[PDB]
């Protein structure tokens, strides 16, 4: 249909105004003294939330161009939360600082591509300086400590996570589900974790962790591309009776199939989600048979001749739970016999020895690690059920923070790590003055989280920030207690990965927006 | 329905405003410092792209006249990418420069037909001069160099492409498809490529490349026109059950059969594709027979007395893959046995002895080159599916680039071949003063891509353009490095076919618009 | 429905305004320096055309009154093309030039009816003067020259047409179809062309020429009126099976059978055509036996006791192709035997010896010439299908041209016969001054085409026209080359028929409009 086209400054201020509504709404939540946001609901009483991600999910603008802005930085910032388990909000407020001052500079006549190069350079520097500031978390004393701090000072959670990591190792797979009673349980079951995301959002039935959660679903396994509901319909109507959900693992699910799936599960007919089968070529189908072994299903390939129309309920795979992130599919407790799976580990481990090249060796060992290693399960005991759902949540959160900390360590939270790292870069320069401006734009941007945190507390951001730069290392301001001192010892810290990802993603989308000269949307 | 009719200047300003929206949108992406265009999507996050072809696809305007302008230069410029594999953006910006200054002259009162004659003279001259400036690509060392640069300096792609051209020849068929594992496969199979396109769009299952791709399809060869799906039903429902797609090659398909096939396969019922048989008269039939022998099916003609209703599944052909352009149909790994096909090649090779005429000899040798040569298949290897898909994209690209490069050579890229060629034509004149103005208009237009490139780099286009005019041959400005020198040593180059095609198509649509006195469109 | 009624001047200016849009849109295409008109199409890129007929087709105006005007001179001028193969556009600019000044004068107070009579007298005069100016085209050298200039200087088309006319005669039946390639075949087949229109539209096959085209159809011969699909259905089912189209030859087709046939072939099932038939009485019935002899069929009459249900497939006649115009039917290559043909020829040829009356002699001579002469078939060859279709269209055009030229000869083209002829009429007067003004109005208007052509060419019309008036005979201005001299020698010329037709039809609709006092249309 006819388009509205906007250029240059015209487009830029629209974008800016848009990210300003997104950010200004999202960032009032930021401190420990962060405020509430009220989100209306058609049915019932409005939601009161301090969760910036909940707020962001609800922000869409009337003006088409502004909306494009807000939606751009939503989409890119959400990737922070998806990588490190937190920092999407942080990414939003950083993005707003960089985009604001950046466009400001653009409009004085500086070269946007140079500004971008200067920003990107400064950001890379900042990540190095951040890797220096990082304090490792390795020994399980510190693992339990961080899990605890992430549990809102609950030593039970730190304890729990630390133990699951002592069992399946730092590298291993850990889930948490409803408890059966007062006391917590930990068990290791048949299960796997591999890289596939939901093929579309809206598949998500649990928006708090941003994932698709399915209990006792049937699992379809097909090596082929599925574009058509013609091949699907018999199995849809066969699952409809039995009354269980469905998870699709195929070479892909495209067009008519995927759209008809989104609509079909939106209407309440046979709720289904879909993922991509991991790998390509031969390793793809090999892994698809690893799944066939694990869930006790059977693979449908056009290569051996069986088709999707030929599929009944017995050909279907089943497991007691599956969880699907933006980027990750993990399977817990497949019906598949321990005979079949042990035999699979045997066959592939036999395939391991013949490797001439290291590559095949490592891929097969990846497969066996995932399949034989299984999955660690945490059942969370609360007494009353309400406490259970709540504590389960805290444990999930604490778990993500702890994985992140295990990987890249921890740095001072409260956004003082950013201001710190930023202050170590005062002498960083580029190839031309525009690049230099770009650098100082990003270094100034890096003080926005702490300044906002302080602002929410009703204190003077300029002063606090000044004082925090004055110090060195993990010395910072504890917003809760209004006390300066070592932020880590005070127990206020972020996994290094989330701060880094926040900054990287923020700078990414800002860079694109600064270098954007044309916007094309539909007509009102 | 009632029309709005604009005449003269009143129409020409509308056309100009339309191509101004389109060109201004597209050309911000031009060059190594090119900007981002943000293209809105109805659901989800906006698209951020530097792909000017992608941008052009979205430009449609509310004013029906303005729209007509934009859509005209849109459709002619697209033929540039279609011919040479690139330069559609370039054509768009050229066409905008010619149309703008040409229409200026028209309004001052000069003769549009004379101006058009002048422009066309200048472009004929320019294409000559382009041929001169061109450096050949013949030795495979050079074929690798070209493929390499189009791959963004991956010598692997260059090597690969050159080896495939070493197998099936420079004039030979080369396809690229997904990889089975790490590293690369090069496989020659029995196969054929001829010029016939889809009789309908919407067939396209890979809108990325805008082409049709079918796996293990059945192929129907019928010598007749088909206007009725009533003849089609028995074979359609015979193939429906076999679960494999269908290719239709006949004299033509019109009206009811056309629409019923498009609708039926767009509904997910029996997905099929249909193309014009190559050629006309008798050789259309002998070429149909070549394709029959290749795909191991049987030719249905009214003449022998078989009807499309009596057609069975063995009468049909099959191959592993088929691929359909706008103008091209490719058949990969036909089922047909070496006995049948070498028999056919023997026959056609004996027919060449008996050939009375050169023409007959040439068309027979055509059929034997297509039939004997087969098809080269590049399977692209990588570590992960993403690196594979990306590398596959760069390979397809660099493959187009290298083909064009083989046909007409290479000229300095980055907009300087055009400006060079324009500099050599300062003394060119026409029959009268208007034609002379036309010539000068084209010659100025040719500076447009260089100038735009430089401008997106943040430099002064007049200065760079002036400096490049001062040099000779392929001396120009490298915009990525800000360094003047020899553009072919510096690895910045276009295939001469794309520069020529861009210029010719720009000047075609431009000439047409300049000489347009009347516009007719539906009423708002 | 309530009406809008206008009278007198109101109505007149509305009409004038309408024809000004029509003619101003169409006349920009005129002559060799003719301009481009851009026509919007709903889906896809716009059409760019120099074809004034195409442009005319698209013109429909919002104001219902103006629209009536446009549509009037539109419908009448399309008759110029209809009769002579060309001249619709010319007629349209002539009609604009007469209507304009005719109305100026009506509003100046002159009698419309008297103006119309003065215009008509001037046109009669001009047609005679045209007949004097006309140079004969009879010998095959002339014939081929005309065909060549109508073929856009292709001497092959001249030769080919002259060849076909040498085989079957100038009054002979000549058809052109696709070639079997590279070489033009010319074959005489047994066939006939008679004056029969389609009994209904929507038999339409190839709407470009708007004609019915059937391939290898069965031909049914019966003499009677058919109001019911009942009687036919048995032999209709006989035809449905064989899978070939069908021609019905009867006295008429009316009512429920007519509508049921419309719907039957509009929905696609058993495509069939129905015949005029030629004439009344014995001219309808007696000659129909010749169709029977030629097509290999049998006549069905209620008079000899046989009925249409008793009709089978073999009772029907069979021919290779039949084409039906609005007004004309042609039967191409029927199977009926040379013995049967020569025999029936013998019958009717010895029936003319026995003709008591001249009228019988003439009608019988018509049937024996139509039958014994046969049909010529030009199969147009070229190198490629595209070259072939282009050449075929040109050959068709050139043919119609050369027929017209054979009948009435040729005159100076490119505008100058009209201006010449008009120049010879300065002393022509009527009964009263109003008629005089009418005559001068027409004579002025005959300068419009030349003037317009010269205006498209960028030169001064008054001057050129002046100069052409200055001379004698076929002296004129060659617009393409800007050269004065003998138009015919320079190879710029029209069949006298189309110039006569243009003038006559234009002045017809102009006279109608001038003498219109009231218009009535629906209410917006």
Short mmCIF file of N, CA and C in Angstrom, two decimals, chain A residues 129-211:
data_model
loop_
_atom_site.label_atom_id
_atom_site.label_comp_id
_atom_site.label_asym_id
_atom_site.label_seq_id
_atom_site.Cartn_x
_atom_site.Cartn_y
_atom_site.Cartn_z
N UNK A 129 38.25 -3.02 29.63
CA UNK A 129 38.43 -2.48 30.97
C UNK A 129 37.48 -3.16 31.97
N UNK A 130 36.38 -3.68 31.42
CA UNK A 130 35.37 -4.37 32.19
C UNK A 130 35.86 -5.76 32.52
N UNK A 131 36.53 -6.40 31.57
CA UNK A 131 37.15 -7.71 31.83
C UNK A 131 38.26 -7.60 32.87
N UNK A 132 38.96 -6.47 32.89
CA UNK A 132 39.91 -6.21 33.97
C UNK A 132 39.22 -6.04 35.33
N UNK A 133 38.22 -5.16 35.41
CA UNK A 133 37.49 -4.96 36.67
C UNK A 133 36.83 -6.24 37.20
N UNK A 134 36.64 -7.23 36.33
CA UNK A 134 35.90 -8.43 36.70
C UNK A 134 36.56 -9.22 37.84
N UNK A 135 35.73 -9.63 38.79
CA UNK A 135 36.12 -10.54 39.86
C UNK A 135 35.57 -11.94 39.56
N UNK A 136 36.46 -12.93 39.46
CA UNK A 136 36.02 -14.28 39.08
C UNK A 136 35.11 -14.90 40.12
N UNK A 137 34.19 -15.73 39.65
CA UNK A 137 33.37 -16.52 40.55
C UNK A 137 33.49 -17.98 40.08
N UNK A 138 34.23 -18.78 40.86
CA UNK A 138 34.66 -20.14 40.46
C UNK A 138 34.40 -21.19 41.55
N UNK A 139 35.04 -21.00 42.69
CA UNK A 139 34.80 -21.85 43.86
C UNK A 139 33.33 -21.78 44.26
N UNK A 140 32.78 -22.87 44.77
CA UNK A 140 31.34 -22.92 45.01
C UNK A 140 30.93 -22.07 46.21
N UNK A 141 31.90 -21.60 47.00
CA UNK A 141 31.55 -20.66 48.05
C UNK A 141 31.01 -19.39 47.41
N UNK A 142 31.73 -18.92 46.40
CA UNK A 142 31.35 -17.72 45.67
C UNK A 142 30.13 -17.96 44.76
N UNK A 143 30.03 -19.16 44.18
CA UNK A 143 28.83 -19.54 43.45
C UNK A 143 27.57 -19.41 44.31
N UNK A 144 27.63 -19.97 45.52
CA UNK A 144 26.53 -19.87 46.47
C UNK A 144 26.30 -18.43 46.91
N UNK A 145 27.38 -17.68 47.13
CA UNK A 145 27.26 -16.27 47.48
C UNK A 145 26.49 -15.46 46.43
N UNK A 146 26.87 -15.61 45.17
CA UNK A 146 26.24 -14.86 44.07
C UNK A 146 24.80 -15.29 43.87
N UNK A 147 24.56 -16.60 43.85
CA UNK A 147 23.20 -17.11 43.78
C UNK A 147 22.35 -16.55 44.90
N UNK A 148 22.94 -16.45 46.09
CA UNK A 148 22.27 -15.86 47.24
C UNK A 148 21.91 -14.40 47.02
N UNK A 149 22.91 -13.58 46.70
CA UNK A 149 22.68 -12.17 46.42
C UNK A 149 21.60 -12.00 45.36
N UNK A 150 21.57 -12.92 44.39
CA UNK A 150 20.58 -12.89 43.31
C UNK A 150 19.22 -13.41 43.74
N UNK A 151 19.18 -14.02 44.92
CA UNK A 151 17.94 -14.55 45.49
C UNK A 151 17.28 -13.56 46.44
N UNK A 152 17.79 -12.34 46.47
CA UNK A 152 17.44 -11.33 47.48
C UNK A 152 17.89 -11.74 48.89
N UNK A 153 19.16 -12.11 48.98
CA UNK A 153 19.86 -12.43 50.23
C UNK A 153 19.38 -13.72 50.91
N UNK A 154 18.87 -14.65 50.10
CA UNK A 154 18.38 -15.93 50.58
C UNK A 154 19.44 -17.02 50.42
N UNK A 155 20.02 -17.46 51.53
CA UNK A 155 21.14 -18.39 51.47
C UNK A 155 20.71 -19.77 51.01
N UNK A 156 19.42 -20.07 51.14
CA UNK A 156 18.86 -21.37 50.74
C UNK A 156 18.99 -21.60 49.23
N UNK A 157 18.70 -20.56 48.47
CA UNK A 157 18.79 -20.61 47.03
C UNK A 157 20.26 -20.77 46.61
N UNK A 158 21.14 -19.93 47.17
CA UNK A 158 22.56 -19.99 46.85
C UNK A 158 23.08 -21.39 47.08
N UNK A 159 22.69 -21.92 48.23
CA UNK A 159 22.94 -23.30 48.63
C UNK A 159 22.53 -24.26 47.52
N UNK A 160 21.25 -24.17 47.14
CA UNK A 160 20.62 -25.06 46.16
C UNK A 160 21.32 -25.08 44.80
N UNK A 161 21.48 -23.90 44.23
CA UNK A 161 22.15 -23.76 42.95
C UNK A 161 23.57 -24.31 43.03
N UNK A 162 24.30 -23.93 44.08
CA UNK A 162 25.67 -24.40 44.26
C UNK A 162 25.74 -25.93 44.22
N UNK A 163 24.75 -26.58 44.84
CA UNK A 163 24.69 -28.04 44.84
C UNK A 163 24.38 -28.66 43.48
N UNK A 164 23.43 -28.07 42.75
CA UNK A 164 23.16 -28.54 41.39
C UNK A 164 24.40 -28.41 40.50
N UNK A 165 25.20 -27.37 40.75
CA UNK A 165 26.44 -27.18 40.00
C UNK A 165 27.56 -28.12 40.47
N UNK A 166 27.48 -28.57 41.71
CA UNK A 166 28.45 -29.55 42.17
C UNK A 166 28.13 -30.90 41.53
N UNK A 167 26.84 -31.18 41.32
CA UNK A 167 26.44 -32.43 40.67
C UNK A 167 26.67 -32.43 39.15
N UNK A 168 25.97 -31.59 38.39
CA UNK A 168 26.12 -31.64 36.92
C UNK A 168 27.24 -30.76 36.39
N UNK A 169 28.02 -30.15 37.29
CA UNK A 169 29.16 -29.35 36.89
C UNK A 169 28.75 -27.97 36.41
N UNK A 170 29.69 -27.02 36.46
CA UNK A 170 29.42 -25.64 36.03
C UNK A 170 28.80 -25.58 34.63
N UNK A 171 29.26 -26.47 33.75
CA UNK A 171 28.87 -26.49 32.34
C UNK A 171 27.49 -27.08 32.09
N UNK A 172 26.93 -27.74 33.10
CA UNK A 172 25.78 -28.61 32.91
C UNK A 172 24.42 -27.96 32.81
N UNK A 173 23.40 -28.79 32.59
CA UNK A 173 22.03 -28.35 32.34
C UNK A 173 21.15 -28.41 33.59
N UNK A 174 20.58 -27.27 34.00
CA UNK A 174 19.74 -27.22 35.20
C UNK A 174 18.38 -26.54 34.98
N UNK A 175 17.31 -27.20 35.43
CA UNK A 175 15.94 -26.70 35.35
C UNK A 175 15.40 -26.54 36.75
N UNK A 176 14.31 -25.80 36.90
CA UNK A 176 13.59 -25.80 38.17
C UNK A 176 12.07 -25.81 37.92
N UNK A 177 11.37 -26.72 38.59
CA UNK A 177 9.91 -26.81 38.46
C UNK A 177 9.22 -26.83 39.83
N UNK A 178 7.90 -26.98 39.82
CA UNK A 178 7.10 -26.98 41.04
C UNK A 178 7.59 -28.06 42.00
N UNK A 179 7.51 -27.78 43.30
CA UNK A 179 7.90 -28.74 44.30
C UNK A 179 6.73 -29.62 44.66
N UNK A 180 7.00 -30.77 45.27
CA UNK A 180 5.94 -31.68 45.70
C UNK A 180 5.51 -31.46 47.16
N UNK A 181 6.23 -30.60 47.88
CA UNK A 181 6.03 -30.50 49.32
C UNK A 181 6.83 -29.40 50.00
N UNK A 182 7.06 -29.56 51.29
CA UNK A 182 7.78 -28.57 52.07
C UNK A 182 9.23 -28.43 51.65
N UNK A 183 9.90 -29.55 51.39
CA UNK A 183 11.35 -29.52 51.24
C UNK A 183 11.81 -29.73 49.81
N UNK A 184 12.94 -29.13 49.48
CA UNK A 184 13.48 -29.10 48.12
C UNK A 184 14.05 -30.45 47.68
N UNK A 185 13.95 -30.73 46.39
CA UNK A 185 14.51 -31.94 45.81
C UNK A 185 15.48 -31.62 44.66
N UNK A 186 16.45 -32.49 44.44
CA UNK A 186 17.36 -32.39 43.29
C UNK A 186 17.57 -33.77 42.64
N UNK A 187 17.21 -33.91 41.37
CA UNK A 187 17.33 -35.22 40.70
C UNK A 187 17.89 -35.10 39.28
N UNK A 188 18.66 -36.09 38.83
CA UNK A 188 19.23 -36.07 37.48
C UNK A 188 18.50 -37.00 36.51
N UNK A 189 17.87 -36.44 35.48
CA UNK A 189 17.01 -37.24 34.61
C UNK A 189 17.47 -37.24 33.16
N UNK A 190 16.90 -38.17 32.39
CA UNK A 190 17.12 -38.22 30.95
C UNK A 190 16.63 -36.92 30.34
N UNK A 191 17.52 -36.26 29.61
CA UNK A 191 17.22 -34.95 29.07
C UNK A 191 18.40 -34.32 28.35
N UNK A 192 18.11 -33.27 27.59
CA UNK A 192 19.08 -32.68 26.69
C UNK A 192 18.87 -31.17 26.56
N UNK A 193 19.93 -30.44 26.22
CA UNK A 193 19.77 -29.02 25.89
C UNK A 193 20.52 -28.65 24.62
N UNK A 194 19.79 -28.16 23.63
CA UNK A 194 20.41 -27.80 22.36
C UNK A 194 19.94 -26.45 21.84
N UNK A 195 20.61 -25.97 20.80
CA UNK A 195 20.35 -24.62 20.33
C UNK A 195 19.27 -24.63 19.25
N UNK A 196 18.08 -24.23 19.68
CA UNK A 196 16.99 -23.86 18.79
C UNK A 196 16.07 -22.93 19.56
N UNK A 197 15.54 -21.91 18.91
CA UNK A 197 14.58 -21.08 19.59
C UNK A 197 13.19 -21.38 19.09
N UNK A 198 12.19 -20.73 19.68
CA UNK A 198 10.87 -20.77 19.10
C UNK A 198 10.97 -20.16 17.70
N UNK A 199 10.23 -20.71 16.74
CA UNK A 199 10.29 -20.19 15.38
C UNK A 199 9.56 -18.85 15.30
N UNK A 200 8.64 -18.63 16.23
CA UNK A 200 7.97 -17.33 16.39
C UNK A 200 7.66 -17.05 17.85
N UNK A 201 7.73 -15.77 18.28
CA UNK A 201 7.11 -15.49 19.58
C UNK A 201 5.59 -15.57 19.43
N UNK A 202 4.85 -15.23 20.47
CA UNK A 202 3.41 -15.52 20.60
C UNK A 202 3.25 -17.01 20.94
N UNK A 203 4.31 -17.78 20.75
CA UNK A 203 4.36 -19.18 21.17
C UNK A 203 4.59 -19.24 22.66
N UNK A 204 5.01 -18.10 23.21
CA UNK A 204 5.37 -18.00 24.61
C UNK A 204 4.12 -17.98 25.48
N UNK A 205 3.98 -18.97 26.36
CA UNK A 205 2.90 -18.97 27.36
C UNK A 205 3.34 -18.54 28.77
N UNK A 206 4.64 -18.31 28.95
CA UNK A 206 5.15 -17.82 30.23
C UNK A 206 6.05 -16.63 29.99
N UNK A 207 5.45 -15.43 29.87
CA UNK A 207 6.13 -14.18 29.52
C UNK A 207 7.14 -13.67 30.57
N UNK A 208 7.05 -14.16 31.80
CA UNK A 208 7.96 -13.71 32.86
C UNK A 208 9.41 -14.15 32.60
N UNK A 209 9.60 -15.40 32.18
CA UNK A 209 10.92 -15.89 31.74
C UNK A 209 11.08 -15.86 30.21
N UNK A 210 10.03 -15.41 29.52
CA UNK A 210 10.06 -15.20 28.08
C UNK A 210 10.15 -16.46 27.24
N UNK A 211 9.55 -17.54 27.73
CA UNK A 211 9.76 -18.85 27.14
C UNK A 211 8.46 -19.63 26.90
#
